[PDB]
Design a protein around this ligand. Structure first.
Ligand SMILES: *[C@@H]1O[C@H](CO)[C@@H](O[C@@H]2O[C@H](CO)[C@@H](O[C@@H]3O[C@H](CO[C@H]4O[C@H](CO)[C@@H](O)[C@H](O)[C@@H]4O)[C@@H](O)[C@H](O)[C@@H]3O)[C@H](O)[C@H]2NC(C)=O)[C@H](O)[C@H]1NC(C)=O
Ligand SMILES: *[C@@H]1O[C@H](CO)[C@@H](O[C@@H]2O[C@H](CO)[C@@H](O)[C@H](O)[C@H]2NC(C)=O)[C@H](O)[C@H]1NC(C)=O
Ligand SMILES: O=P(O)(O)OC[C@H]1O[C@@H](O)[C@@H](O)[C@@H](O)[C@@H]1O
Ligand SMILES: O=P(O)(O)OC[C@H]1O[C@@H](O)[C@@H](O)[C@@H](O)[C@@H]1O
Lengths: 151, 145
């Protein structure tokens, strides 16, 4: 019912479990941000290791078309990767819904850069961009502030 | 002889990093036989073989050079107070990551006090079937909003 790590198990995997544990106070929260202009107005909902979608799909981050509440899963938390930088944490959710035309029809993916901010536990979640111009390895990029990424 | 993208916003971002082009950033890390020295440059040759390397990994034990990413294949994104620079096209792995080409992802965070400093490796994700990557960080006032 929480984040599941993907990758090789070992010393590094063990460190990533520790990072997820540190983010526990954020689990109960839900972050949202609406961007874009009609007919492409989108609302992104992001959560840390908890269901961010409306259909129990295991979504960690979803995209909702404002015009018509169509929900698209950007990434699932059962496919998480996480890394600790000096003043930030990079959180990745793979296994989102598949593209039909772009990116070799691969599953969508979310990359969230959580930067250190001593003033708040969590705030300023914002979509940065969607890299959908590659034949593979595409991603939706986001940012958010959190004191938990600080040294 | 400069970064080649795959976007007007991206070209503007590259332009913004111009003052870093002439610099060379180095950082040694790890413990032999796994001690590596990383050399990173923005849109300029970081290697010794004119291969177009934007970031190379040097094995300190024997001086062997491995290209992590080529500025021949650059992607760049701008967050509120950070810039993400990506160089794909590095040397291929022999065993990890389906033998794909190495890749470098550099998180350039805002720091009002320096034009560019604190370049360092953060981690190497080499446990995936594909889309592996070397993660780095560095500070720069140019990343500040
Ligand atoms: C960006 O610049 C890169 C460096 O200049 C480009 O890399 C080169 O890309 C070409 C075209 O895809 C590759 O050509 C292939 O070569 C292999 C043989 O590879 C092996 O032998 C060569 C020569 O001895 C050696 O350089 C390689 O490392 C391998 O040992 C052929 O079997 C294929 O048919 C094809 O000709 C080059 O191999 C590749 N060289 C490298 C890694 O620098 C890259 O394509 C450019 N990307 C762009 C256009 O954005
Ligand atoms: C993460 O969770 C998703 C959603 O449950 C898993 O995707 C399903 O995988 C099964 C088996 O491969 C398929 O039959 C379903 O059609 C998939 N549903 C989708 C794509 O939404 C996914 O396999 C999980 N990742 C893991 C644990 O490997
Ligand atoms: O699936 P295709 O046809 O390639 O379209 C892809 C696009 O779909 C839309 O519904 C949104 O989710 C966009 O962010 C996405 O880039
Ligand atoms: O080429 P293989 O055997 O897969 O080993 C991969 C490793 O090689 C070393 O020389 C370094 O470049 C490491 O960063 C890399 O992870």
């Amino acid at each position: 019912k929480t984040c599941d790590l993907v990758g090789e198990k070992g010393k590094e995997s063990e460190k990533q479990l520790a990072l997820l544990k540190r983010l526990t106070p954020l689990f109960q929260k839900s972050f949202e941000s609406t961007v874009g202009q009609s007919p492409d107005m989108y609302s992104y909902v992001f959560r840390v290791c908890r269901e961010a979608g409306q259909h129990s799909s295991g979504a960690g981050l979803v995209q909702i078309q404002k015009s018509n509440g169509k929900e698209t899963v950007v990434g699932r938390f059962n496919e998480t990767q996480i890394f600790q930088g000096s003043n930030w944490i990079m959180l990745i959710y793979k296994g989102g819904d598949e593209y039909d035309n772009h990116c070799g029809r691969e599953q969508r993916r979310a990359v969230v850069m959580i930067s250190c901010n001593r003033h708040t536990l969590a705030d300023n979640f914002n979509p940065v961009s969607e890299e959908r111009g590659m034949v593979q390895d595409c991603f939706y990029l986001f940012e958010m502030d959190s004191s938990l990424a600080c040294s």
